[PDB]
Amino acid sequence: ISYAAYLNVAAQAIRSKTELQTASVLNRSQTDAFYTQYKNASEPTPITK
Amino acid sequence: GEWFRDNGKHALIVYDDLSKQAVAYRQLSLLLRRPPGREAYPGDVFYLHSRLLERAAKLSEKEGSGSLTALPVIETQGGDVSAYIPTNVISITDGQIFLEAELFYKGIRPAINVGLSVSRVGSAAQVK
Amino acid sequence: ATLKEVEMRLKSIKNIEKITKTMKIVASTRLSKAEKAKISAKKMDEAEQLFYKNAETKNLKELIVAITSDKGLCGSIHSQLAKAVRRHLNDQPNADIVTIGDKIKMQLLRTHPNNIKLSINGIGKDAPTFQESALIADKLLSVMKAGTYPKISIFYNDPVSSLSFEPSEKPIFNAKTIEQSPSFGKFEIDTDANVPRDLFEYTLANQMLTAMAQGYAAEISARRNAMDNASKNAGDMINRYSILYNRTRQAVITNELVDIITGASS
Incomplete structure (x- = not known):
């Protein structure tokens, strides 16, 4: 929870029939993003965003 | 080389190289006017090597266990x-060691192409 | 040398030519969709970063967010941004680096490995979105403690035009820096809420997008250029190997024919 992440979840109610919902709306919604923490070469496991 | 094998000793014979031999065999035959074959070689240029290399063997106990191991050499272009x-010769032997200029200049010496070289005899003749 | 050698090493280049050509048009459509996603990002910058221009906000340990992508085959996108971050990191060697995209993590891991504390994966497939922008920005705040550095810098590639791009840097100002800016008073802000705190976390997310959208469009215009030059050069080899083939094919047939004629005299 943080003002960016907080407006985002609000940007997914207003984003989630399938009418006023073009292709890039359900692609604004999907993220293939995995954050990997790093220390001294890598350190811990890669998690979904 | 056979003298060793036939008397319970072991010979290694290096045929360096069978390419040059086939070429002589070709010269000998064209001048005898025997009608040429592929690349002017004699029709039986395969038999030339097949019968040579079959002589290399490991005899039975009844024959004193002598061996002839052949290491023929071939040169490609x-x-x-x-x-x-x-x-022809790949057909005959029990495997080959492939050497490559590409690998020699990369530092790999002997320049063996590990993925292409094999020994059909395999682990069977290798110190455990 | 042989027909088989030439037939299989021509064929593979005929594919690369067809292939690199397909991704010149693939990343042409992908440019139209990423010029509209770029403009909507750049137009939104003037409106958001204007407040700071008027409030006259300036700076007073550093977090460096570097943005390229995961993909290669795009000219020198990754190479000349890593080149920028290095000339910058030369002045300030004691900074924490966050990477977005693997092709910049590797560029940087080989040069200053221990400065990198976070990496972002799977980044340049579709266009960038506020959701990726904000969720990257959220981890920034969480795991890097974004809110606390004296200086935060986004490194990215600006599309000068279609045919080129420029490696660029931008600052992000924290809450403290916003509040204590020379001309902050010009605005009647209600000092009850944490307008600066929110203004910072919003601008972290928002200007990252601004950066990602441009870098991404810089890339899409380096990719349809590298592939354009690839097809143009793969076709040059297909000219060499079409002719050599039409040769080696004739030579094969002639030499089998000499063999046949010799065999047919005797």
Whole structure:
């Protein structure tokens, strides 16, 4: 929870029939993003965003 | 070499190289006017090597266990292992060691192409 | 040398030519969709970063967010941004680096490995979105403690035009820096809520997008250029190997024919 992440979840109610919902709306919604923490070469496991 | 094998000793014979031999065999035959074959070689240029290399053997106990191990050498042109004589000889032997200029200049010496070289005899003749 | 050697090493280049050509048009459509996603990002910058221009906000340990992508085959996108971050990191060697995209993590891991504390994966497939922008920005705040550095810098590639791009840097100002800016008073802000705190976390997310959208469009215009030059050069080899083939094919047939004629005299 943080003002960016907080407006985002609000940007997914207003984003989630399938009418006023073009292709890039359900692609604004999907993220293939995995954050990997790093220390001294890598350190811990890669998690979904 | 056979004298050793036939008397319970072990010979290694290096045939360096069978390419040059086939070429002589070709010269000998064209001048005898025997009608040429592929790349002017004699029709039986395969038998030339097949009968040579079959002599290399490991005899039975009844024969004193002598061996003849052959290491024939072949020379290719531009790495063309699909050429006529090299195909014949690959047919005959129990495997090959492939050497490559590409690998020699990369530092790999002996320049063995590990993925292409094999020994059909395999682990069977290798100190445990 | 042989027909088989030439037939299979021509064929593979005929594919690369067809292939690199397909991704010149693939990343042409992908440019139209990423010029509209770029403009909507750049137009939104003037409106958001204007407040700071008027409030006259300036700076007073550093977090460096570097943005390229995961993909290669795009000219020198990754190479000349890593080149920028290095000339910058030369002045300030004691900074924490966050990477977005693997092709910049590797560029940087080989040069200053221990400065990198976070990496972002799977980044340049579709266009960038506020959701990726904000969720990257959220981890920034969480795991890097974004809110606390004296200086935060986004490194990215600006599309000068279609045919080129420029490696660029931008600052992000924290809450403290916003509040204590020379001309902050010009605005009647209600000092009850944490307008600066929110203004910072919003601008972290928002200007990252601004950066990602441009870098991404810089890339899409380096990719349809590298592939354009690839097809143009793959076709040059297909000219060499079409002719050599039409040769080696004739030579094969002639030499089998000499063999046949010799065999047919005797």
